[PDB]
Write an enzyme that holds these catalytic residues in place. Structure first.
Site, mmCIF file in Angstrom:
data_model
loop_
_atom_site.group_PDB
_atom_site.id
_atom_site.type_symbol
_atom_site.label_atom_id
_atom_site.label_comp_id
_atom_site.label_asym_id
_atom_site.label_seq_id
_atom_site.Cartn_x
_atom_site.Cartn_y
_atom_site.Cartn_z
ATOM 1 N N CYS C 151 0.811 -1.198 0.000
ATOM 2 C CA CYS C 151 0.000 0.000 0.000
ATOM 3 C C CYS C 151 0.874 1.290 0.000
ATOM 4 C CB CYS C 151 -1.016 0.002 1.138
ATOM 5 S SG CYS C 151 -0.357 -0.282 2.782
ATOM 6 N N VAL C 155 0.547 4.414 -2.706
ATOM 7 C CA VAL C 155 0.378 5.797 -2.296
ATOM 8 C C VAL C 155 1.467 6.666 -2.905
ATOM 9 C CG1 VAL C 155 0.429 7.430 -0.343
ATOM 10 C CG2 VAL C 155 -0.826 5.239 -0.144
#
Ligand code: ICS
Ligand code: ICS
Ligand code: CLF
Ligand SMILES: [Fe+3]
Ligand SMILES: [Fe+3]
Lengths: 482, 510, 510, 483
Positions: C151, C155
């Protein structure tokens, strides 16, 4: 697609009879018929031969006198040790397979769901088993001290080798001070379970009743009854007992499901014998009527029609108080009856049933099926006598196929031809019927369900017939590509 | 009360308050012992003193774990093509044999009786045989009728061979029709003996008087097996992978697992009659269960066959031994696909062995099963403490002792031949073990002694369809391993499920 | 106390009197709520009033039954020949994915990280990709490296394609070496989405720019499956019997079941790279789990393939549907051996259906599993009352409703998409059911609500080796049936085992 | 068949280093060494190994992240707080109930350890921020878990990357709900391993729990009040330790953090002495308590009888004659158990060689327990140990021991394959490959679902487990009899 049921049933009879060699055919032809129109009320008239030898090699469903005595009458008596006397097989196959329910601490105060055997070896056959039996009795006395009595259930070799179990029983009763009941139910005797019943009833007479009164202190009431011939299958006798007690009777003993030796011994103190299973225990009722002036009456606790009629019939033998109790019981359970009918009768009405069972249920359950809108189109008994076939006319209609001591071949052909919506029979019949795509419910073991007697049992009966017939499995039989 | 929205059958129904009250009222008049006497006697039956008296029995058998010969005869005969078991004697026997098999397999079981009655004690059973064979042949269209006996027929001493020849002379069956026969006395041995006797009678019928035309095939006899359906299919799979030339003698794996598709098949599959006839030519016969076949193997040896027997091969080593023997007979190596199965099984055991090491067991059943199961337990680091076979001989006890002696995990283990489940109950009550491996009758041992039961032996009446899956082979060993582990893990979770009391150990990963 | 002759580990040890006393002493100073307050709150959490508040949650998730995308990416990549999953991003993720898969399979799970640290927030992860791919390629000798993302990498927005090309330009891996990639953001969807994304990335790598040479084979995508080992072997067996020409796309059944034979195999089996390349040529692609493959099937359709999706086919009718579809694709009939398996399964259900009719269930897991399991339950006459999938959408709820409506046994039933196991707990506490079908996290629901758990969904951490046996096919359906029955019969026996109280119903035969 | 162990270990180092590209090789070479003879407690060996630096990309490190070190290790065990795994769903799913930090509680009612609580970030949370969601979550916890005494917020990777202000949320909501809210910046991009998570988590206890009014003014102190610091009660290890400390005469105010409550943690500054087991994970808060509250701290070791006895004696010597006598009485009480364990298991285990690889403490701490059973350690190493851990290791391992910092999958496989020890003690990611090689393996984190191993009761279990792994029939079955 269109048939005349009576004539089609007659044709099936002709078809199966053609399959036999001449000798067997002549025997079997007398055992197969179609119920005729009748001339309390007889719905039909029937002449069928019954209670004779089975034909060799035909695949009868019948059992033996040992099943009728040990398996049926004596085995349920909970505080006695029942010795299966002879080789190991009989008492192994019959170990805990009849669901004659009881309350007890098995192995300690109760001995039902066990095998006790003399496990005959070749030496026992050659030299006799009486000395072994004497030792066995001593071992039981020591290791099962709370057993109140011992029965000796003779298997085939006992009478063939000339053993004297009655002498053993007399001798050991005096030594250990407990009732010992020798039963000559060897499987070579008779033609079926039936003669085992009669031998076992005679043994109750000869070795339990024929003895000093052990219950002189028993306090009697005007409403004391024995329930005779309810073996508490799945609790059937308990669901019956509650109704009888709610009506105002006192049940002194229930023979023999959940029974103790004390209960059996006290039976001659009652005012009336209520007989459910006529076939298996009518003998001892007839005896008690003759010897003790105790009347007996037949009843039927399968389904609301029979239960209400039975409660009324029984109550009418007593007084206004018990007659009122009957009405109060019928009223109490009417909302349950209505609920069962409303839920299940739409799911079951119009369905056709074939039955095959032993000595009672082939007629006794018919009105319970009829209470759910189901019709019986074939029935028969393994070991019913002429007086059972005559009673069956109160329950089945003209055109019903009737088969005594039906053979595997016959019953296969009859089921395949009729294609009933449900078959109700035993474990030996269940799996072939299901393979045919026909629902089947066991009418001996209740397919491990029950009770079916009484009002509480009617709800379970309905549920079970519905789940067998109205199930998604049947729709999956035919593969979608075939 | 009863409720149509949530119907109560027997189990919950009799716990309703009105039934509890009724039953308490009934108890007042039953003259049963008072509660404190029940406790006193129950405790006593779990004592060392009772154990001693129990083990001093000489004559009474209580809860024996064996059947009579004809059950084995029916079983073995049912594994031949279109073969009807015909039990000469009393018909009650046949109702019982058929019901016993049906309850275990959840399948039909067909057999017939000659329906001898009291008349035969005086006159003999000739007409029962003549007429019976005529009726069976005509009604049920068998290819072969396999005759065994009940105990009454044995006591009366009917001459089977003469009766059958008379039946043929009267036209009951065609002259060339196969009616093998065996004496199967209930008062000798057990069901395993009946299997042996009946199978010998079948082979003798087909082989007698012949000279072999030797070939290198191997005949394989599976024995009396509650898992026959799954086991024989696994055996066939293994044999196929190896490329062995073989004949299975008695294969019930189709007969006791027919489809439900709108047709009832009275007969299905089984050893072909011509295969049984040709089996005399094989150089080798092997038995997977020594105690089901000694008379049969002796008969095979009388045709110059070399024989070997196994003991219900379970687990890594017993499977290895079977494959090495098949490899020796056939001259074919163990193929890579089977070695992969073996290595996967070893992986599973190494993964799980923390749950198996030091576990203690009681094991009962047929002699070969008990041996095989004990051997597999020892491979897991477990202790087969109480091994028992009601039909196990002293020679079997000696074989078990040799097995115990082969492993450091066998120290202190004992094998009890001729003892029953009431003997077993005293073992479990006095020398507690973790797990009991047996048949459905062992549920009473679980109740009485709080020893959890795993069902791996005939009969399994209270669980459904277990017979459809193998326990033999590397695959069956893996199935057995998971069965054992699942029992252990279920108990571990049950022991740790009480919130804030025992659930500190209710681990998510095990 | 401790004893060397019978060593007590944690579970029994802390029940010893000295530990109970110690822990009672500790509790006096912990300042935990008093016992009566605990009872009051516990009861309240089982109420309708609490259920309402629990179901009004908008933001908090408690005990969700789903993982993040990259777990699915690692899973799917692991089913290709000598393929290493390389998760671009933070290394804590990979430690977790590998441990999660190992605990379920009791097997190694290999994957690597690019080990991005805080400086990548400022500079991007280029050097992590370049150096990482160099090190992975050299150390672990993969045939393919399948890149996914954590993740943080999502991002930060690293351009995977450009990074991989730069790596090739710098010699990290050969120019022709296969490095398919996918974005797998944890904050979208679940592990099933990562399976789909990664698989699309693998296929796009091999197919992009190509024109098919059409053939009549079918590609088969199994989906994210806790029972992949047994299931894919069953699938292959079925396909072999039917003679279908196929390619399985992502087969982990050897990878997650290697032998213990003295060699550690980092890689084993899987879809061949050339088979993956040649799969563009097939006319059909089928997915056995709709929710694992929507983007993938859209991509297949972009090459003119016809596609079909199933919902984790369990039981008679779902298996029938798969076989009919295979038959339509291949033009081959269903062979007799498979129809015999079908008929035997029907026989088992008819034999046992008294125990199944009217049983009520809660079922949770992945959307395809829940659907499939519910369908099988309806075929048994059972009621899949509480169906739940944390990663199930409103479209899935609608499919579930159509399934419920297809059977009279679906009348109570509801499907709860997007709900978690704390929601499930309130369902079980307020509308009781007989059985719960789920994964190991369900053991907490068993503890809290006394609803027995059957483990048929990933992950299974507290039982061993269940993944080795199939649940698909007629054979798998029979395995599932026996699993269900065994749980029912075990409970029935436990409910009737108390001597002289409940054991009137402790039947030997059921 | 014949080898010189130190030289053979050095060869294995050369062998694995040859496998790497040049860039990675130069990084890894500093992390692999052989323990040297020590200069003439006591140092048995000396070595220099580089540690606590970044992992090399792509190499298959065994390490975890700062979130594991904070949520998984330090905070997650605290039983009467709700720990929010704050970010997407994965971190808190994988770490749900996998660390066996045992506790007594009614889970979901008064204790919340074996649960996942998460903000389950979706894309809108990443784009718009998750603070408003977090505020709502806190209100939902307050309502649905009313017995929770506090809340922690365990930041996952996205939190610091998208600029959320969890500290502002925590301050605001603490005032509204009247319960401690602890925001932890343990995002996995921080640091290089679990280690920095420990440190961040310790700072959070300092900053958010030890702040404010004394909630325990009524606490009655004794001269023998201690905290046990850094025992996470794996399989009950802390309970097995606590009993000994209490038998000796100490009063354990709190055990951090296995089976710990918030109240126990808050009272820690009332104790007389901090007994630290896990130096790595909790030395930070000990150093703080020494500086701020003048509470001294001392390291001990409860693995095996040599260490237990030395630890009890060392600890007791800090108090008085009464506690010293208590130590001797404890040691005497358990000597029959110790002798029984040794008599049974040492003959089965003596002379066996062991390789270890664990996180921050156990790679040295368990060595003397092995030695008490006659076993020798031939390799060890740490995922995330610092220089001060490697230095302390020299008190436990002998010259010639192979030493590996942040070992790679490739390296450890080769080292195991080459050495073929009798047993490997490491983690779940290591277990199954080792067993496939035919080498016994026991998990040195989860205790392979067994334990406790701390204390005298634990030593019996330790011995049992090592024996059943090594001395079991499976290994003899690996080779098929026809091969
Ligand atoms: S006793 Fe008889 S065969 Fe009347 S031997 Fe048989 S428990 Fe049947 S039709 Mo099994 S005369 Fe009872 C009977 Fe009926 S065993 Fe049960 S079901 S009502
Ligand atoms: S806290 Fe640390 S990795 Fe000191 S992060 Fe880790 S329960 Fe290890 S070597 Mo898992 S510094 Fe504890 C540890 Fe040791 S989780 Fe446990 S076993 S003694
Ligand atoms: S009619 Fe004898 S041991 Fe018993 S099963 Fe038979 S071979 Fe075996 Fe039959 S069941 Fe018994 S033996 Fe007779 S009385 Fe009836
Ligand atoms: Fe069947
Ligand atoms: Fe494994």
């Amino acid at each position: 697609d269109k048939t005349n049921d009576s004539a089609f049933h007659a044709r099936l009879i002709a078809e199966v009879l053609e399959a036999y060699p001449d000798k067997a055919r002549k025997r079997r032809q007398k055992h197969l018929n179609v119920a005729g129109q009748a001339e309390g009320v007889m719905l039909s008239e029937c002449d069928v031969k019954s209670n004779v030898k089975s034909v060799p090699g035909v695949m009868t469903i019948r059992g033996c006198a040992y099943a009728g005595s040990k398996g049926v009458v004596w085995g349920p008596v909970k505080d006695m040790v029942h010795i299966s006397h002879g080789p190991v097989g009989c008492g192994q196959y019959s170990w805990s397979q009849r669901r004659n329910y009881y309350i007890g601490n098995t192995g300690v105060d109760s001995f039902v769901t066990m095998q006790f055997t003399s496990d005959f070896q070749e030496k026992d056959i050659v030299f006799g088993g009486d000395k072994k039996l004497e030792k066995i009795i001593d071992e039981i006395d020591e290791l099962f001290p709370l057993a109140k009595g011992i029965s000796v259930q003779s298997e085939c070799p006992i009478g063939l080798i000339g053993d004297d179990i009655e002498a053993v029983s007399r001798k050991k009763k005096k030594e250990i001070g407990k009732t010992i009941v020798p039963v000559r139910c060897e499987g070579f005797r008779g033609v079926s379970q039936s003669l085992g019943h009669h031998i076992a009833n005679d043994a109750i007479r000869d070795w339990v009743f024929d003895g000093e009164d052990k219950h002189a202190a028993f306090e009697t009431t005007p409403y004391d009854v024995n329930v005779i011939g309810d073996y508490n299958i799945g609790g059937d006798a308990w669901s019956s007992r509650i109704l009888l007690e709610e009506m105002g009777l006192r049940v002194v003993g229930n023979w023999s499901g959940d029974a103790t030796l004390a209960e059996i011994e006290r039976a001659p103190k009652a005012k009336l014998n209520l007989i459910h299973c006529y076939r298996s225990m009518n003998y001892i009722c007839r005896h008690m009527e003759e010897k003790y002036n105790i009347p007996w009456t037949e009843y039927n606790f399968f389904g609301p029609s029979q239960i209400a009629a039975s409660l009324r019939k029984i109550a009418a033998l007593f007084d206004e108080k018990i007659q009122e109790g009957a009405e109060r019981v019928i009223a109490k359970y009417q909302p349950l009856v209505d609920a069962v009918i409303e839920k299940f009768r739409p799911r079951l009405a119009g369905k056709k049933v074939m039955l095959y069972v032993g000595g009672l249920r082939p007629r006794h359950v018919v009105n319970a099926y009829n209470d759910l809108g189901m019709e019986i189109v074939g029935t028969g008994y393994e070991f019913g006598h002429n007086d059972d076939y005559q009673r069956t006319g109160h329950y089945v209609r003209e055109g019903t196929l009737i088969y005594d001591d039906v053979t595997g071949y016959e019953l296969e052909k009859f089921i395949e031809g009729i294609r009933p919506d449900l078959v109700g029979s035993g474990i030996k019949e269940k799996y072939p019927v299901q393979k045919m795509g026909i629902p089947f419910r066991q009418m001996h073991s209740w397919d491990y369900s029950g009770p079916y007697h009484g009002y509480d049992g009617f709800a379970i009966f309905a549920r079970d017939m519905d789940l067998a017939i109205n199930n998604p499995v049947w729709s999956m039989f035919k593969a979608p590509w075939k | 009360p009863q409720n149509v929205d949530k119907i109560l059958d027997h189990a919950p129904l009799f716990r309703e308050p009105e039934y509890q009250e009724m039953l308490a009222g009934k108890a007042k008049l039953e003259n049963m012992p008072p509660a404190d006497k029940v406790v006193e006697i129950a405790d006593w039956t779990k004592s060392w003193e009772y154990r001693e008296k129990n083990f001093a029995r000489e004559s009474l058998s209580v809860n024996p774990a064996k059947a009579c010969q004809p059950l084995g005869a029916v079983f073995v005969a049912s594994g031949f093509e279109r073969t009807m078991s015909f039990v000469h004697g009393s018909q009650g026997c046949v109702a019982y044999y058929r019901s016993h098999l049906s309850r275990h397999f959840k399948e039909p079981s067909s057999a017939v009786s000659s329906s001898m009655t009291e008349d035969a004690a005086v006159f003999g059973g000739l007409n029962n045989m003549v007429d019976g064979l005529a009726n069976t042949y005509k009604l049920y269209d068998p290819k072969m009728i396999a005759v065994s006996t009940t105990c009454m027929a044995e006591v009366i001493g009917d001459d089977l061979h003469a009766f059958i020849q008379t039946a043929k002379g009267k036209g009951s069956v065609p002259e060339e029709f196969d009616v093998p026969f065996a004496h199967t006395p209930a008062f000798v041995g057990s069901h395993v003996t009946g299997y042996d006797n009946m199978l010998k009678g079948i082979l003798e019928h087909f082989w007698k008087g012949r000279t072999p035309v030797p070939n290198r095939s191997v005949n394989i006899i599976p024995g009396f097996d509650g898992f026959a359906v799954g086991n024989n299919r696994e055996l066939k799979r293994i044999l196929g992978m190896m490329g062995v030339q073989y004949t299975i003698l008695s294969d019930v794996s189709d007969q006791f697992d027919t489809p439900s598709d709108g047709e009832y098949r009275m007969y299905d599959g089984g050893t072909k009659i011509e295969a049984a006839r040709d089996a005399v030519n094989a150089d080798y016969t092997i038995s997977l269960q020594e105690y089901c076949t000694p008379k049969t193997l002796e008969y095979c040896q009388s045709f110059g066959q070399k024989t070997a027997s196994f003991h219900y091969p379970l687990g890594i080593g017993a499977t290895d031994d079977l494959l090495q023997k098949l490899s020796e007979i056939s001259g074919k190596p163990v193929p890579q696909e089977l070695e992969m199965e073996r290595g996967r099984l070893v992986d599973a055991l190494a993964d799980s062995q923390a749950y198996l090491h030091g576990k203690t067991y009681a094991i009962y059943g047929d002699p070969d099963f008990v041996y095989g199961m004990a051997r597999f337990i020892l491979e897991t680091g477990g202790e087969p403490k109480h091994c028992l076979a009601t039909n196990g001989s002293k020679a079997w006890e000696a074989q078990m002792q040799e097995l115990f002696d082969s492993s450091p995990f066998g120290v202190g283990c004992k094998a009890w031949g001729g003892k029953d489940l009431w003997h077993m109950r005293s073992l479990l009550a006095t020398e507690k073990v973790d797990l009991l491996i047996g048949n459905s009758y062992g549920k009473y041992l679980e109740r009485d002694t709080d020893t959890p039961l795993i069902r791996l032996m005939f009969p399994i009446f209270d669980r459904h369809h277990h017979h459809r899956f193998p326990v033999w082979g590397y695959q069956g060993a893996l199935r057995v391993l998971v069965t054992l582990l699942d029992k252990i893990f279920d108990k571990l979770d049950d022991d740790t499920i009480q919130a804030g009391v025992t659930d500190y150990s209710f681990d998510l990963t095990r």
